[PDB]
Ligand SMILES: Nc1ncnc2c1ncn2[C@@H]1O[C@H](CSCC[C@H](N)C(=O)O)[C@@H](O)[C@H]1O
C-alpha cells in the first residue's frame with residue numbers, strides 16, 4: 166500500500182542515504198530509472214548487490230506513459246520502491262508521478278539524496294547566487310535551440326550564476342562534454358553576439374560530483390575549451406560577478422588563474 | 431592526514447549517505463556544528479551511536495574564529511571529520527574552511543547529503559525555475575533587513591520561483607517559522623509598497639523536509655499566515671509564474687485552492 170520515491174545520489178552505489186537503503190531493503194519490489202541521469206561511478210549490479218534486491222529497470226516510456234500500470238498496481242498490496250539518480254522529484258516530470266499515485270489510492274513517501282543542484286556548492290560559488298537553470302542541447306536537423314544562452318544572459322545581467330546541465334543520451338550512453346558545451350555556446354554567441362559567452366568568459370566545470378575525487382576546474386573559455394576534464398558526466402557553470410570569497414576558492418581549490426581576482430570580482 | 435566535510439542530511443541521523451557513514455566510522459576525531467540548520471528528527475546521542483564515535487560540537491565562534499586551531503591541528507596527524515546538517519556547503523560559509531585546510535597543508539574531501547535546496551522538489555515546483563535565493567532575517571534593534579523583498583521582486587518579474595531560507599538563532603534555540611516570515615514580508619510590503627508580497631500572494635510552505643511526513647502547504651498569505659505548520663525548520667517559497675502541472679501538484683498534494691489551477695497565461 167506504499168510507494169517510496171528513493172534517491173540514489175550523485176555518483177556511486179554509496180550515495181544513497183542510510184534511510185533510503187534500509188527502506189529499499191524492506192520493499193517487496195524495486196524499480197529504477199536511469200534515463201534522467203546515469204550513476205557513472207557504479208553499476209546496476211553493484212546497486213542490486215548493495216540493496217540485495219532484484220531491480221527492474223524502467224525506460225522513459227515505461228515511466229511517463231505506463232507508471233500506473235507497471236509500478237502502482239504492485240504498490241497497492243506491497244511496499245514498492247522507485248529509485249532515481251540524485252534527489253527524487255528534481256527531474257521536472259517526476260513530481261507529477263505522485264499525483265498518479267494518489268489517484269490510484271497509493272500512499273507515497275519521498276526519501277531524499279544528494280542532488281547536483283546542491284552538490285555544485287563544492288565549486289565555492291554561493292548557492293543563493295544561482296539564478297534560473299538550463300540544459301544545453303545538441304542542435305539537429307533544422308533545429309538549433311538557444312534558450313540556454315538567454316538564460317545565462319538574464320542571470321549574469323543580475324549578477325547570478327547559471328547552472329547548465331549538458332545533453333545526455335542515456336540509452337545510447339552518449340554524454341555531452343563541457344568542451345562540446347563551450348564550443349556550442351561560442352557558436353551561439355557568434356550568432357547572437359550578445360557578448361554573453363566568449364573566449365574571455367569565466368566558466369567553471371564540475372565533473373563527477375559525488376566522487377571522492379571530483380574534477381573542479383575554473384578558468385577562461387579560451388584556456389579550458391580543450392582541457393581534459395575526465396569522464397562524464399560534466400556540468401558547466403557560467404558564474405556572474407564574483408564575491409571575493411568565491412574567487413579565492415576558485416583560485417585555491419579549482420586552479421583558477423589569479424587573474425579572476427581582479428577581472429571577475 | 432585528512433579532513434572530511436560530511437553532511438548529515440535534512441531531518442534525522444539516517445539522512446546521512448552510506449558513503450558518509452562508513453567514512454565517519456573510520457575517522458579518529460569527529461567534530462560537528464548544528465548552528466547552520468536544524469535536524470528536528472534526531473539528537474547528538476542518536477548520531478553518535480550510528481557513527482559509533484564521540485562528537486565534539488563546535489559553536490559558530492569556534493568554527494569561524496578557531497577552526498584552524500581546534501580542528502586542523504588534529505587533521506595533520508589523524509583522519510578528522512566535520513559534520514553539518516544538510517549539505518555542508520549549501521547556504522553556509524563552510525566552503526571557505528576548505529581554503530584554511532589547504533593553507534594548513536591538510537587535504538580535504540566533501541561528502542554530500544540531502545539539502546533543503548533540492549528537497550524543494552517535493553513542493554512540485556520545477557527546480558530549474560527557481561531564481562536567486564534569499565534569507566528572511568529577524569530584525570534587530572533599529573536594523574530591519576529588507577533585501578529579501580527585492581529578491582522576490584526580481585525573480586517574480588522574470589517569472590521565477592523564490593526560495594526563502596528562514597533565520598535561526600541556534601544558541602537561543604529560535605527558529606523562524608513561515609508565519610513570522612510572512613508577517614515580516616507584509617511589513618516590508620507596507621513600507622516599500624511594490625505589490626510584491628500581499629495577502630493575495632500565493633506562497634508555499636515546506637516544514638521538516640526529510641521526515642516521512644513533512645508539512646507541504648500552498649495558498650494565499652491571508653489564509654496561511656496564521657496556520658500551524660508544525661515544528662521547525664520551515665522554508666518559505668514565493669512561486670513565480672506556474673506551469674499547469676506545478677499548479678496541479680500544489681492543489682492535489684499541497685492542498686492549494688483549486689482556483690490556482692486556472693493559471694493566467
Ligand atoms: N529539513 C528542513 N525542512 C525545512 N527547511 C529546512 C530544512 N533544513 C533546512 N531548512 C531550511 O534552511 C535553513 C538552514 S540554511 C543551511 C542549509 C543546509 N546546508 C542544507 O544543505 O540544507 C533553515 O533555517 C530552514 O529555513
Ligand SMILES: [Cl-]
Pocket residue numbers: 211
Ligand atoms: Cl564489480
Ligand code: NA
Pocket residue numbers: 282295296297298557558560561
Ligand atoms: Na537553482
